[PDB]
Amino acid sequence: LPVLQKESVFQSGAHAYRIPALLYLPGQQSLLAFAEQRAELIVLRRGDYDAPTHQVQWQAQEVVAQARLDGHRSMNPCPLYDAQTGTLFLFFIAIPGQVTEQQQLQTRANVTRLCQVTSTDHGRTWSSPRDLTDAAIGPAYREWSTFAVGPGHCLQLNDRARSLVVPAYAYRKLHPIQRPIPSAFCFLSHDHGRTWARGHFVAQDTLECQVAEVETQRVVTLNARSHLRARVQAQSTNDGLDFQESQLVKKLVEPPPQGCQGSVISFPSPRSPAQWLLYTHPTHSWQRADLGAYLNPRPPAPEAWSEPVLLAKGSCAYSDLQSMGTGPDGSPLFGCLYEANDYEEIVFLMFTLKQAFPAEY
Annotated binding site for substrate: 18, 38, 169, 171, 208, 225, 288
- Kindly report the backbone phi and psi dihedral angles of residue 51, in degrees, each rounded to the nearest multiple of 5, phi listed first: -50, -50
Choose among 168, 262, 272, 155: nearest CA to 219.
155
DSSP string, 262-328: -EEEEEE-----SEEEEEEEE--SSSSEEEEEEEESSTT-GGGPPPPEEEEEEEEEEEEEEEEEE-T
Q: Does residue 25 interact with Cl ion by CB under 5 A?
A: yes
- Please state the closest distance from residue 29 (CB atom) to Cl ion, in A: 8
Under a CB-based contact definition with an 8 Å cutoff, are residues 151 and 123 in contact?
Answer: no
- Please state the closest distance from residue 151 (CB atom) to Cl ion, in A: 22
- Please state the closest distance from residue 30 (CB atom) to Cl ion, in A: 7
**Cβ atoms within 10 Å, residue 267:** 21
Whose Cβ is closer to Cl ion: residue 13's or residue 27's? 27
Whose Cβ is closer to Cl ion: residue 138's or residue 325's? 325
Q: Does residue 28 interact with Cl ion by CB under 5 A?
A: yes
DSSP string, 63-96: E-TTS--TTEEEEEEEEEE-TTT--EEEEEEEEE
Whose Cβ is closer to Cl ion: residue 28's or residue 216's? 28
- Is 318 marked active-site? yes
Number of residues lying near Cl ion (CB under 5 A): 3
- Please state the closest distance from residue 28 (CB atom) to Cl ion, in A: 4
Q: Does residue 27 interact with Cl ion by CB under 5 A?
A: yes
Whose Cβ is closer to Cl ion: residue 28's or residue 87's? 28
Query: Which part of the chain contacts Cl ion (CB under 5 A), choosing from 18-26, 59-67, 95-103, 275-283?
Result: 18-26
Q: Does residue 31 interact with Cl ion by CB under 5 A?
A: no
Residue nearest to Cl ion (CB): 27
- Please state the closest distance from residue 49 (CB atom) to Cl ion, in A: 12
Under a CB-based contact definition with an 8 Å cutoff, are residues 281 and 260 in contact?
Answer: yes
Give pairs for 160-165: CB < 8 Å, separation 24+. Answer: 161/190, 161/191, 162/82, 162/83, 162/84, 162/192, 163/188, 163/189, 163/190, 163/239, 164/80, 164/82, 164/89, 164/188, 164/189, 164/192, 164/193, 165/211, 165/213, 165/220, 165/239, 165/240
Say how many residues make up the chain.
Answer: 361
Whose Cβ is closer to Cl ion: residue 5's or residue 28's? 28
Q: Does residue 323 interact with Cl ion by CB under 5 A?
A: no
Q: Which residue positions form the known binding site?
A: 18, 38, 169, 171, 208, 225, 288
Query: Which part of the chain contacts Cl ion (CB under 5 A), choosing from 24-32, 106-114, 143-151, 175-183?
Result: 24-32
Catalytic residue among 49, 81, 279, 318: 318
Mask: binding to Cl ion, 236-265, rule CB under 5 A, as x and -?
Answer: ------------------------------
Whose Cβ is closer to Cl ion: residue 27's or residue 52's? 27
> Is residue 103 classed as helix, strand or coil in its secondary structure?
helix
- Please state the closest distance from residue 27 (CB atom) to Cl ion, in A: 3
Interatomic CA distance for residues 155 and 163, integer angstroms: 8
Catalytic residue among 36, 213, 339, 345: 339
Q: Does residue 13 interact with Cl ion by CB under 5 A?
A: no
Residues facing residue 171 across a β-bridge: 146, 182
Whose Cβ is closer to Cl ion: residue 28's or residue 146's? 28
Choose among 336, 355, 334: nearest CA to 346.
336
- Please state the closest distance from residue 186 (CB atom) to Cl ion, in A: 24
Choose among 328, 359, 333: nearest CA to 348.
333
- Kindly report the backbone phi and psi dihedral angles of residue 114, in degrees, each rounded to the nearest multiple of 5, phi listed first: -100, 125
Mask: binding to Cl ion, 63-102, rule CB under 5 A, as x and -?
Answer: ----------------------------------------
- Is 81 marked active-site? no
| Site of interaction with Cl ion (CB under 5 A) | 25, 27-28
Active-site residue set: 318, 339
